[PDB]
């Protein structure tokens, strides 16, 4: 085509989706990770995660307002990944890298899994 | 903070939101522009437009499944802007620039309004 492109558009959209999440606007699901609860937009979760994409395209699960994750999933690891989904920024640290990588593997977030593997390999 | 950032994350999210729109997945509103109907995600519309942000933060309008735009709004102009919201690409042409600018003014999409003004000024 002969379209023009606004470079900062995708980043501006994601910033506004994060502002709606912070103010709890039009969030349509609560993700339960052991004792912890996280409110989010189903569309953003599907856009970032192979696991959520599979869950919310399922004819019965698409209508659930609550999703319970596997008990082995660490709430902090999930929180860090949820923040990444809405911001592009990953808070990866020596003390959380194992939980972040295991959670990214479960959630099917291949680019996160890749950077965790590289950061671990460098420390060995 | 000490976060790492994935450069292509925002663009990848927007690409997946557009794929869900094309397949009509989790769309929660229909925008009526005269005889034409456009299905979309309320969150993406709010993230891109000052007008939709005001409409869907309203305690009564937030629950409507149908929104009717002003009869002066051109459906093609709306279609071009909706495509821009989901892609960052604006199909601006000599034959549509007036309709695109009027629609962007109504929708409160200031960056689109700005490029339309500059393209018009250059043709004068």
């Amino acid at each position: 085509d002969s379209c023009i492109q606004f470079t900062r558009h995708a980043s501006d959209v994601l910033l506004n989706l994060n502002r709606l999440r912070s103010r709890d606007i039009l969030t349509d699901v609560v993700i339960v990770v052991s004792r912890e609860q996280f409110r989010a937009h189903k569309t953003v979760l599907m856009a970032c995660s192979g696991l959520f994409y599979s869950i919310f395209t399922d004819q019965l699960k698409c209508n659930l307002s609550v999703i319970n994750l596997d008990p082995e999933i660490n709430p902090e690891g999930f929180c860090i990944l949820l923040d990444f989904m809405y911001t592009s920024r990953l808070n990866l640290r020596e003390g959380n890298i194992m939980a972040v990588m295991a959670t990214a593997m479960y959630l099917q977030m291949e680019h996160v899994v890749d950077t965790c593997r590289k950061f671990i390999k460098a420390s060995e | 903070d000490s976060c790492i950032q994935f450069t292509r994350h925002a663009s990848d999210v927007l690409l997946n939101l557009n794929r869900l729109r094309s397949r009509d997945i989790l769309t929660d509103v229909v925008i009526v522009v005269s005889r034409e109907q456009f299905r979309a995600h309320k969150t993406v519309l709010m993230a891109c437009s000052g007008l939709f942000y005001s409409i869907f933060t309203d305690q009564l309008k937030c629950n409507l499944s149908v929104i009717n735009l002003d009869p002066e709004i051109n459906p093609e102009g709306f279609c071009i802007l909706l495509d821009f919201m989901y892609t960052s690409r604006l199909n601006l042409r000599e034959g549509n620039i007036m309709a695109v600018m009027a629609t962007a003014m109504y929708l409160q999409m200031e960056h689109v309004v700005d490029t339309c003004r500059k393209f018009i000024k250059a043709s004068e």
């Binding site: 606004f6 470079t7 | 690409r89």
Partner: peptide
């Protein structure tokens, strides 16, 4: 704005 750019030419993509």
């Amino acid at each position: 704005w750019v030419i993509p």
